[PDB]
Each structure stands twice: as C-alpha cells, then as structure tokens.
Nucleic acid binder design. Structure first.
Ligand code: MG
Ligand code: MG
Ligand code: MG
Ligand code: MG
Ligand code: MG
Ligand code: MG
Ligand code: MG
Ligand code: MG
Ligand code: MG
Ligand code: MG
Ligand code: MG
Ligand code: MG
Ligand code: MG
Ligand code: MG
Ligand code: MG
Ligand code: MG
Ligand code: MG
Ligand code: MG
Ligand code: MG
Ligand code: MG
Ligand code: MG
Ligand code: MG
Ligand code: MG
Ligand code: MG
Ligand code: MG
Ligand code: MG
Ligand code: MG
Ligand code: MG
Ligand code: MG
Ligand code: MG
Ligand code: MG
Ligand code: MG
Ligand code: MG
Ligand code: MG
Lengths: 51, 159, 49, 222, 185, 58, 148
RNA sequence: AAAUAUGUAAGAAGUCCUUGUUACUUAAUUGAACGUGGACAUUUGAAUGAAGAGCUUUUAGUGGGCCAUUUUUGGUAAGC
RNA sequence: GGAAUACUGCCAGCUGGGACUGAGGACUGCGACGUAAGUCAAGGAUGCUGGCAUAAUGGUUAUAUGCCGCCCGUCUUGAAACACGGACCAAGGAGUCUAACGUCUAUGCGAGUGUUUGGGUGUAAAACCCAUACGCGUAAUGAAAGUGAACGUAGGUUGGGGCCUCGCAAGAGGUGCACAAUCGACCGAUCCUGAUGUCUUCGGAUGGAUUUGAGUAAGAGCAUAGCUGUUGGGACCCGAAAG
C-alpha cells in the first residue's frame, strides 16, 4: 500500500539486500587502499610540463 | 499551360552517361531471369521500347513473368496512405540483378557452414550480427613517438 | 441529391399526394357493418341460403 | 490438516536458502567491482611508469534523461524519443552503447541530457525509483520475489542482480532494461546550474553528452 | 504532458456481456463465465465469447453440415457443439446417431436427430457432461453467405453486386457495364 | 475573388494518422498477367500431378 | 420514439449537429437525381454502373404469366412426397411400386438436376426437365413423363 | 559531385539433398513451373520499441484557412 | 625529500532543526533483533494531555482589503471592436410525420416466412381463431430465342480457433468449422471444334479458348421493432424580386 524507500528505512534495506549488514560491519564504504610507490617516467613529466 | 507528359522532367534521368553511348553490350541479353528474382530498374535511354516510367527509376522489384524479350516486375507503390502493387512489363535492357539478396544468401551459406562445423563440438555458435561495439582499452607508447605540441596559428591574408 | 452507396429509389410523391390519402380507420366498423348486412339479408330471405 | 505450521516452516526454510544465495552473490559482485576499479587505476599508473598512456575502454552504458517538454518536436526526433521510451520530461532510461544507439542519440541531442552513470547513481536510481513492467503494469519492486518471478529465467534473482546486469552490460541487458519501467525523475533540487537549458553542455547549456556530470545531475533529480 | 503513442481511454472493441436481455441467456453466460474463470480449458472461453455474439455472427448450422463434420476421421463419436441455431436439411437422406448441443433446434432438426437416434442437448447439460469440453467439436455456420455481404466493397473492377431494388433489362446493364455503351466498368 | 491554389500542408500528418501500413504478403500470389502458354501448360501439369498423387495415395 | 432521438441531445447546442460553416441549407446539390451526368457522376459510376442508356429490345404488352416456370432441383425433389410415406418409398427401392410425383401440382414448371437423389425409382411428371435431371432420374431407375 | 531526403534485403513462406507431372521448352531428363521424402530450432540469424496485431461495415463534420524557422518564385517593396 | 591541504568523487558513516501528509481497517507477506519466549521503526498513526461544549469552529450572506477579470450571441484566418442582433420581463417559439430504402442491433420462426385484403368470433375499433392466394426467399445467365449448377470423402495447397492421442511439462502427431490467399471443377453468355444420325438441312455429342456473369460448390431467409443515414414530400424554422 505504500512505497518505503531503501537508503532510508534500514528495515527495507535489509529486506532487499542481506549483504548490507556485513557491508556496514566491515565498513566497506571506507576501504583503505594499499600504498604503491611507483613513479611516472621522465618523458611523461617533461611532456606534461612542456610549453 | 502546365505539361505532364510521360517523360516529363526526365532529361538528366534518361541521359545515357559520359563516354558510354552507343550499343549495349551482350551480357545484358545473356543474363537469365527467373520468376522470383529480385531486380533493379534503371532505364536505358537508347532503348525506347519497354521503358519504365520515371517513377520506377531506382526501384527494386520481383520478377513474376518471363516473355520473349521482357520481364514482368512487381513494385509496391505508395498511393495516398497505403501501397498498391504495380505490374511492369520491362525489356531486359532496363533490368539488372540486385546484389543485396545474393549478399544475404552468401551470409546464410557461411552461417550454415559455421553452425554445422560447430555442431560436432558445441562451442557457443554466435551466429547473429552485432553492431560496431565501443573499442576496448589499449596502451599507447611514446617510443619514437614523443608527443608534438600544436598551437593555433595567427591570422594572415593569403591573397 | 445523389450521395453514398444506396439503391436508386422511385418514390412517386411529386404531386399533391397528401390530398389523396386513404387511411382505413374504418376497417373494424366496416367488418361489423358487413356482418350486420349479411344477417339482415339472411333474415329477409329467411329460408334461402 | 493444520496447514499453518508445516508448509509455513518449509516456505521459511526455502526463503533462508534464497537469502543465502543472494548474500553470496552480492559478496561476489562487490569483490569484482572493487577488483575492476583497482585494476584500472593500477593500469593507468603502470602506463605512466612505463612512459606510455593508458587509453581506457570506451563506455558501454549511458543514462539518458529527457529535458524538453512534449510540444513542438520534429517527427524523426519525436519517433526516436518514443522508441527510447522518453515520452515525458524528466524521464530516464539506460541505453547500451553501439553504433545504432549512438546514431539515435545524435538524432535526439537537443532534447536530452545523457552521460555515463556510475555504480552509486545506478544503485540509488534502482533502489528509490525502481519499477518493473509486469503484464503492462508499473509495479514497485520493493521485494526480491518480483524480480525472481519476472527475470528469474535469465539468472536474475534480486535487485542487486538487476543492478549488476545493468552496470556490467551483460547478455540479458536488453531484457533487464526493458523490464525496468522508465524512471520518473523530478526537477533537480539545486537547479540546473545554468541560466538556460537548451544549449549544448559545451556551450554552457544542458543538452548533449555531459560525460561524468550526469551523475551529479541525476542524483540531484533523484 | 505525455507524448502519447496510442489513443487514450479506448475501449477493447470486443463485446462482453451480450446485448440480449434474454434471462436464460444471461443464466447461460453466468454458468460459462464461472467455467471459463475456473477450469483453465480453452473451450469454455471460446463458447463464452460465442454466447456474446450478435445474430449475423451466429449463422445457423445445418444438419448436413453436422453430418459432414462427423464424417471426418476420428470425429464420429464427438459431441457437436453449436452456439446458435441448428436448422435441418432435406438434401441429406441418412443421418448418424450423434449428440448435438445447441442454443436452439428447429422442429425439423430436432426430429431428424432424434429419428436417427442421437440426442439434442442444451449448453448447460453440455456443461455438466463435459465441464472442460471433453471430446467436443465446435461448428460455425458460414458468415459470408448473407445477402448484405454481396454489396460490401462495391467499386470499379470489384465484381461486387450493386445495391438495387428492381432487376432485369434496363436496370443498370448499360453505359458502364458493356463496351458497346461507352466503357465496361 | 481569388483563393489558395494548392498545398500539401497537413497531408503527411493525415496519411500517418492510420496511414502507411504495408500490403499483406501471401503464399501463392495470383497468376494473372502471366504468359498464357505457360498457364495452359501449367493447368495440364497440375492435373497430371493430381492424378499421380491420387493413384499413389489411393 | 422521440425520447431516444439525437434531437433531444442537440438541445442547447447551437447548430443541432449540422455545423457552423456549412449549414443545413435546403438543397445544395439539386433535388432527387439531379446532375447524375454532371456534378454527381462519380457516385453514379462508382456505385451504379450501367445506369444511363438502353440495352436490348423492347417487348410491347408483356404478361408475366407466359413466362411462369418455377424451377425445382433434384436435391429437393423428394420433399414433394409426404413424410409418412417417404420412409416407406425409400425402403422399398423397387419398380412396379415407384411413387408418382406431380411437380406441376406441386407448382413447378421445370426440373433441374443439381444433384444426388437416392438410388430409388420415381415417376416424375413435369412440363420441362433439364438434360442432366432426366439423366440422373433415369440413372436412379425412374422415368420422366411429360405433361401439359 | 555532396549533405539531407529515397527503393530493396537482413530466413521456417529459409537453405540444401533426392526425384514425379506437362499439351510448355530443349538436339537431348535439357530446362521451366508446381509437386512426394529427409536434414538443419531458440543467438531462428542486426539494433531499439511494441502501448496489443490484423480485418470489416457504416456514418458526421470539413472541402474560405492563416502564422513561424529554414528552402523558394514574381515584385522597389508590403502586416503583398 | 617528506608531508599537508585544495578540488573532484564514494560510504548499505553518524547526527540536529523545519514543513506537508496519516490513505488503509481482524489475521495472512517479506524481513530484522534474540538460544528461546517473544519483540520491532517489518504489506499506510498511534500514545499522552488541555480548553470549549457553544455561534467558539464552520456554513450562508452583505461589505472591506490584496491580486486578477473587456459583452454576450454570430459569421470569420482573425471580435472587446469604430462588424451585425440585443432597452426590459412573461408566455409562445424551430430536425417532425409519412412512402420506399442502406448498415447495425434485438426478437420469433427457419428452407421457409408473413394471422389483421377477407372470413369466424367477441366482454365489440381490443383480445382470440382461420382457408385459398399473394409477396419476398429457396437459381442463375443471356438483348433474346433459350439453356440451366458433384470427376473427386462437394476438390487440391498454405494458414487456421477448438477438439483427440502421446508426454510431468516443453513440445510432437491427427482432425481441422468460420475466415484468408491461391490453383482447379460445375452452370449461363461469347468464340471455336463438329460424333452417331438425318424432313439434307436439321440435330449438337465430344473436346477446347490471354474472353465474360450481381452464379454453383451440404441453403439463410422472412417478419416485427429501435438508433443512425437516404430520397420524395411545406420537410429544422422565418425570408424574396417574380410567375
Ligand atoms: Mg498507490
Ligand atoms: Mg544519369
Ligand atoms: Mg513506337
Ligand atoms: Mg531552493
Ligand atoms: Mg533559466
Ligand atoms: Mg479553397
Ligand atoms: Mg490555377
Ligand atoms: Mg460542441
Ligand atoms: Mg450531424
Ligand atoms: Mg447557424
Ligand atoms: Mg452541406
Ligand atoms: Mg464554404
Ligand atoms: Mg466525407
Ligand atoms: Mg465531402
Ligand atoms: Mg569533499
Ligand atoms: Mg458565523
Ligand atoms: Mg469563521
Ligand atoms: Mg462572514
Ligand atoms: Mg458583492
Ligand atoms: Mg474585490
Ligand atoms: Mg486587470
Ligand atoms: Mg474579413
Ligand atoms: Mg477599431
Ligand atoms: Mg455597419
Ligand atoms: Mg449582416
Ligand atoms: Mg441593435
Ligand atoms: Mg417558455
Ligand atoms: Mg409462400
Ligand atoms: Mg391470405
Ligand atoms: Mg416484386
Ligand atoms: Mg479452395
Ligand atoms: Mg424524410
Ligand atoms: Mg414565403
Ligand atoms: Mg416565367
């Protein structure tokens, strides 16, 4: 009789999507990426800074 | 007064060609037409007998009748808000075979051969045509291709 | 005048036809009068058929 | 024949099995999404390190919103809008990108705003305004059993299955997209950002292909 | 505003709930709308829609037509079903022992069938004998045999029966109908 | 009193109201206008074919 | 009856369903069959071809009693025998007791042979018969006797 | 020699294999047309949409039009 | 060299204020939190409290204020028009009836149908009952003389709802009414061909033909009634100059 919105109403969010509980549990909205120390080539930097 | 005769406004349409006047070559007479063939209509101006009307120039039809020097062709014509079928008696100088049908036929033959060879393996035949897909990712190198910078040019007279 | 696909009619009403219109309202009364005349004639010729 | 406990418990058990299947499917989807995005980022970084340029793949999916009213439309764009199911202003639909659909979009450029939708805006669109076409009726989704009953032939069981099929343009994108009723958005909450809509986005207007800014517009309209 | 691709608020164009106010016919359509709702057999829906029909869409079926239909292979013991009137035909001389369910039988048709030894049945008795239309054979009379359909599509080079009251010589057999008087059609 | 001579304004809209439906195609189009020598042969050939099939599946 | 006509529904509406531009005027195309060769030609030729002109020869003083000859087909021939004796005659498919049918007394002038009487002999008396009708009657084993 | 418009085709009423009829046709089972039996099914043969598809009868009003962007004729031009 | 920050984006991150709405009316569904009992924000609002219980809310009406609002009808491409009718009010005031029809619908009977010209009878213009005719239909086609509808399961092919058989179903096969397309057969007209024969000029068998018919091919009609449409009628109403 009435359309309840998910993205509010966490009850209907958990009804539609069982993965939302464990998404919130491990906080996959804020997932920290692994740091990589690679550097661009000198040709890339001089092309970028070229007039 | 106004003037709507049979060959009205057909000057350039029934003009012959550049450097292709004269007699017609014998392959047009040696072609064979059977009932059910798909043909294109293009009038030859040097053959005044059995000509199509100017409406049917550039039209494509199906053969329904074969006579001594001529072919019966069926054209669907838009009149008012619907189509009527029209039967045309055209001499074979104004007729050539259409190539769209035979391309579809050779596609059918290759498609059936592919299906038959893949029937013994079961390898997800994929027999339908697809449109031009968006292109995939690629890596573009600068070895020997360091990018060259361009700028807009100023105005000049050039006369 | 002439219009859609209908049969050609011939309705002859171009004279003053409304002056000569005979409606037989008197059918039942005329039947009663005929029966009465037959009865009186039989009474007048009382044995004859 | 009590019939209020036995088959009720059996139905509940079948529901738990379906929920477990949906849960593991959504975990797999999330893992492959994050793997794809990190792979693209790392490929760009490796091309820069090697001195090359990573040209990313062209977009496979566009979202199209009708921006113009229904009066005074020429017949060929009008027909193309009807065939793309944009029969109302602020109506939106996903389109698979091929040569055919690109020529359609070029036909209807001055009456639409379109671009490349992201996962978040696709998910918000399907969650908030998600309506299926069930025997010519517009039914709110609101439960996975509707999507199970209507798209379960092509492996699609849940709303996240439908979202995955939309964003990764899969073998049954056509069926899933036609199952989705055209989205009825409102006007944007902060306005259009321009004084004047009916110029191209490049000329400071609203129509045409804004590439990644369709997410901002669609989220303000949704 | 909506760019409508179809006409709004259009009727289906199909006659439900027949225009007749015959109370027994209304009882029959009540029974068969129950059967068509709850038996999932296509026979019930077909005969319900046939019950709705108008008179010119229910031409009479002759007993000769019934016998010809029973002469089909494997159709000798089927129940003939006519949603309409059964008239008889004196052009046949032998008639089989069939069962025929119909709305109406003429006196000659009913006498012919019961003399040959079969039986004449109403549609509600058909309903209680074959609720899903088991072993039945629906027969329809010829719709395009009416006198009115002769004139439909009258035009040049149609061969399609002018609307006319009197016939004969000098009634529409002149200019426009032979080459000696102008043109032919 | 002069008037408008001619225009095709509104005519394609009128045609497209319930307009430009394609003609119905059938198996076996009509044989009229076909060569009478061919038709004369064809009737006899079909009669012989009918007799042969009747004798085969009699 | 008046209460169901569209005159009642046109009350209040100005032009009574007859239009504002073109009105209900008296006779804007002539009376009766006016202009059948002129302004009304297309209707006349589309819907009544053959209307104008004369076709054959005249016949002065035609009495339609000289040409009285109602036709009877063979497939309805057996209806002239009453039903209670019809079964008896069909079962006794014999000569020397063949039923006699007076088609003239039934009110017919000619017997036409449309098809398929049964294989019983009958004595058909008629003013006229067609060739196929006589052939089918004789093939059934009866005879045609001409009367006047 | 464009751009825009425009004809046809994108399968089961298809394709292939084999062989019956004829008074047509051929030097000739040569062919033509129509035929009997077998094989190839859901990616059955591009896209998108379908809001049902197809068919028929009957009859109203109307048959003075005008305006805008672009194409365009006469006219110095015109709310021509 | 190591960070920070901006910008852009994501979170099924948290949280405060404001407004409008509360449709539905036993239970049933999908869920969530709990070992369980159970509870819940999960298929649409309940709980607690106050004042009044009356002209207080509200309705009606006159007026005031803010903003808006040109005279109706009509012809017309275009009317508020410096276009026409209209000072006002009451009453009257215009698509009717009939003859014959078209389509459609309802009804009765149905290869038939129509009692009502007439007769019988009557509680007397009613109701009830009925013979012979006649009309339309059941046969067409020719100018006419005239002739007159089965080669065949009343034909073949394609498609066909429904039904039957097998199958859990999907499907496959059989039969296929109506209807559609097409090729044939039959009847009449036209053009040929011209058998046995004979008042030797009559007869017209048989086989054909890019011809032709408002035909046949297991009948559908007849009668009454209704809307709409047609024609003649004063004919929707009022209106000439004339004759
Ligand atoms: Mg609702
Ligand atoms: Mg050229
Ligand atoms: Mg010449
Ligand atoms: Mg604001
Ligand atoms: Mg603005
Ligand atoms: Mg004009
Ligand atoms: Mg002119
Ligand atoms: Mg109105
Ligand atoms: Mg009207
Ligand atoms: Mg008026
Ligand atoms: Mg008029
Ligand atoms: Mg006018
Ligand atoms: Mg009209
Ligand atoms: Mg008109
Ligand atoms: Mg930020
Ligand atoms: Mg008050
Ligand atoms: Mg108040
Ligand atoms: Mg007040
Ligand atoms: Mg006031
Ligand atoms: Mg005021
Ligand atoms: Mg004002
Ligand atoms: Mg004016
Ligand atoms: Mg003025
Ligand atoms: Mg004045
Ligand atoms: Mg005036
Ligand atoms: Mg005045
Ligand atoms: Mg009054
Ligand atoms: Mg009679
Ligand atoms: Mg009488
Ligand atoms: Mg008569
Ligand atoms: Mg047929
Ligand atoms: Mg009248
Ligand atoms: Mg006067
Ligand atoms: Mg005078």
């Amino acid at each position: 009789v009435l359309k309840k919105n998910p993205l509010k109403n966490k009850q209907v969010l958990l009804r539609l999507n069982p993965y939302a509980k464990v998404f919130a549990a491990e906080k996959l909205g804020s997932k920290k990426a692994e740091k990589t120390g690679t550097k661009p080539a000198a040709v890339f930097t001089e092309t970028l800074k070229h007039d | 007064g106004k003037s709507h005769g049979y060959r009205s406004r057909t000057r350039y349409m029934f003009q012959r060609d550049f450097r292709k006047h004269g007699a017609v070559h014998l392959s047009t007479y040696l072609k064979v037409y059977k009932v059910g063939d798909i043909v294109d209509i293009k009038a030859n101006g040097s053959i005044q007998k059995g000509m199509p009307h100017k409406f049917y120039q550039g039209k494509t039809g199906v053969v329904y009748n074969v006579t001594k020097s001529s072919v019966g062709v069926i054209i669907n014509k838009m009149v008012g808000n619907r189509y009527l079928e029209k039967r045309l008696n055209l001499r074979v100088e104004h007729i050539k075979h259409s190539k769209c049908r035979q391309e579809f036929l050779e596609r059918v033959k290759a498609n059936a051969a592919k299906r038959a060879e893949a029937k013994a393996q079961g390898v997800a035949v994929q027999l339908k045509r697809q449109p031009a897909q968006p292109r995939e990712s690629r890596i573009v190198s600068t070895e020997g291709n360091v990018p060259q910078t361009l700028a807009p040019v100023p105005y000049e007279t050039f006369i | 005048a002439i219009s859609k696909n209908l049969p050609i009619l011939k309705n002859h009403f171009r004279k003053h036809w409304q002056e000569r219109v005979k409606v037989h309202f008197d059918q039942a009364g005329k039947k009663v009068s005929r029966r009465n005349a037959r009865a009186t004639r039989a009474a007048k010729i009382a044995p004859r058929p | 024949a009590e019939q209020v406990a036995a088959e009720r418990a059996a139905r509940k058990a079948a529901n738990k099995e379906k929920r477990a299947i949906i849960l593991e499917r959504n975990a797999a989807y999330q893992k492959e999404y994050e793997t794809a995005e990190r792979n693209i980022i790392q490929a760009k970084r490796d091309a820069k390190a090697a001195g090359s340029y990573y040209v990313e793949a062209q977009h496979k999916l566009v979202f199209v919103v009708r921006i113009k009213g229904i009066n005074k439309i020429p017949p060929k764009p009008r027909k193309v809008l009807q065939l793309l199911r944009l029969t109302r202003i602020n109506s939106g639909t996903f389109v698979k990108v091929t040569k055919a659909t690109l020529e359609l979009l070029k036909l209807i450029e001055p009456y639409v705003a379109y671009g490349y939708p992201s996962y978040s805006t696709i998910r918000q669109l399907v969650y908030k305004r998600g309506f299926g076409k069930i025997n010519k009726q517009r039914v709110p989704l609101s439960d996975n059993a509707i999507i199970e009953a209507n798209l379960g032939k092509y492996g699609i069981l849940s709303i996240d299955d439908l979202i995955h099929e939309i964003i990764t343009v899969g073998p049954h994108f056509k069926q899933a997209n036609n199952f989705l009723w055209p989205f009825k958005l409102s006007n944007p909450s902060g306005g259009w950002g321009v004084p004047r809509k009916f110029k191209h986005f490049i000329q400071g207007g609203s129509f045409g292909n804004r590439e990644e800014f369709i997410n901002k517009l669609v989220k303000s309209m949704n | 505003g909506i760019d409508h691709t179809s006409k709004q608020h259009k009727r289906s164009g199909h006659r439900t709930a027949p225009k007749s106010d015959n109370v027994y016919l209304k009882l029959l359509v009540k029974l068969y709308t129950f059967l068509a709702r709850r038996t999932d057999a296509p026979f019930n829906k077909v005969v319900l829609k046939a019950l709705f029909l108008s008179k010119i869409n229910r031409p009479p079926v002759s007993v000769s037509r019934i016998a010809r239909a029973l002469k089909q292979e494997g159709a000798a013991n089927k129940t003939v079903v006519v949603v309409g009137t059964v008239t008889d035909d004196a052009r046949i001389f032998e008639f089989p022992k069939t069962t025929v369910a119909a709305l109406r039988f003429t006196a000659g048709a009913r006498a012919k069938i019961v003399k040959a030894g079969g039986e004449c049945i109403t549609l509600d008795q058909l309903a209680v004998r074959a609720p899903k239309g088991q072993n039945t054979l629906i027969l329809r009379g010829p719709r395009n045999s009416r006198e009115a359909v002769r004139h439909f599509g009258m035009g040049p080079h149609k061969g399609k029966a002018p609307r006319i009251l009197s016939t004969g010589r000098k009634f529409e057999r002149a200019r426009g109908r032979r080459r000696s008087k102008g043109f032919k059609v | 009193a002069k008037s408008k001579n001619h225009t095709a304004h509104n005519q394609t809209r009128k045609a497209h109201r319930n307009g430009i439906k394609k003609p119905k195609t059938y198996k076996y189009p009509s044989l009229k206008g076909v060569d009478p020598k061919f038709r004369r042969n064809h009737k006899h050939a079909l009669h012989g074919t009918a007799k042969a099939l009747a004798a085969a599946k009699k | 009856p008046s209460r169901f006509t569209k005159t009642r529904k046109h009350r209040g509406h100005v032009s009574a369903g007859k239009g504002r531009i073109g009105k209900h005027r008296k006779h804007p195309g002539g009376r009766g069959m006016a202009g059948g060769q002129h302004h009304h030609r297309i209707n006349m030729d589309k819907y009544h071809p053959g209307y104008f002109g004369k076709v054959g020869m005249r016949y002065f003083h035609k009495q339609q009693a000289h040409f009285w000859k109602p036709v009877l087909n063979l497939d309805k021939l057996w209806t002239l025998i009453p039903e209670d004796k019809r079964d008896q005659y069909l079962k006794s498919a014999s000569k020397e007791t063949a039923p006699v049918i007076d088609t003239l007394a039934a009110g017919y002038g000619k017997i036409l042979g449309k098809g398929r009487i049964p294989n019983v002999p009958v004595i058909v008396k008629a003013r006229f018969v067609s060739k196929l009708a006589e052939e089918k009657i004789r093939a059934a084993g009866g005879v045609v006797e001409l009367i006047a």
